[PDB]
């Protein structure tokens, strides 16, 4: 699809879901010229770009490359994206996908620089929780939740899974952040000790904000 005029969202047979942006070097040019020029005629291309054509006739044929913008792995095969301008009067425009095995999900842009930080911190908290509990147990046996995968119930690291075919870029997993609601208060206040920042109550506020206000 197109989220935008310079960018694109996609899927794979294998489950990846990615967003590709076209570079600004190409945006200045495509903005300052009339399309008839591209095929033949004079576009003034920087010294470098041509030398990539001659040095690599196969790769740089076009001659620019998208910069991968997001990548993330959801084990379904995404059939349709639907870019919505809003969901239920929400401000943040979402793009809601739907998969083969049956699914719906959404990618919501986070417009803050402030939120993406917090949510980031919460994904990092819950991501290795099964490791943290385990280190506290080991060191509390040394001097005075038994399995290493206790909190994840299976061995998998998160980033290793959600990465899979290729590493995640900017997509922060909001379905992991949402297990934080399901823990007992003892465990929540245990995990949250890692943040100099706000208390459990404010985490839960933040996590819950997305369904209420953003969709």
């Amino acid at each position: 699809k197109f989220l935008d005029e310079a960018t694109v969202i996609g899927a794979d047979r294998y489950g990846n879901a990615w967003t590709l942006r076209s570079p600004p070097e190409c945006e200045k040019i495509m903005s300052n010229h009339d399309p008839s020029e591209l095929s033949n005629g004079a576009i003034k291309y920087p010294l470098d770009v041509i030398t990539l054509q001659q040095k690599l006739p196969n790769t740089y044929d076009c001659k620019f490359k998208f910069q991968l913008l997001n990548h993330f792995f959801v084990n379904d095969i995404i059939t349709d994206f639907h870019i919505l301008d809003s969901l239920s009067n929400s401000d943040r425009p979402g793009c809601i996908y739907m998969g083969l095995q049956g699914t719906v999900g959404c990618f919501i842009p986070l417009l803050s620089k402030g939120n993406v930080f917090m949510m980031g911190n919460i994904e990092n908290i819950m991501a290795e929780a099964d490791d943290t509990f385990y280190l506290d147990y080991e060191s509390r046996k040394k001097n005075n939740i038994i399995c290493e995968g206790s909190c994840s119930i299976l061995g998998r690291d998160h980033q290793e899974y959600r990465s899979y075919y290729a590493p995640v870029r900017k997509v922060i997993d909001g379905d992991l952040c949402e297990n934080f609601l399901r823990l007992s208060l003892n465990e929540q206040e245990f995990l949250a000790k890692n943040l100099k920042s706000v208390q459990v109550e404010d985490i839960i506020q933040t996590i819950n904000e997305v369904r209420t206000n953003y969709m």
Partner: peptide, 26 residues
């Protein structure tokens, strides 16, 4: 200038591939 996305799973995948028969919880 980037794009930061947040993922949710609204409705979970429904192809049920495995089953088991017992008594798990009382």
């Amino acid at each position: 200038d980037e794009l930061y996305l947040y993922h949710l799973t609204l409705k979970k995948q429904t192809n049920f591939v495995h089953s088991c028969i017992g008594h798990f919880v009382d």
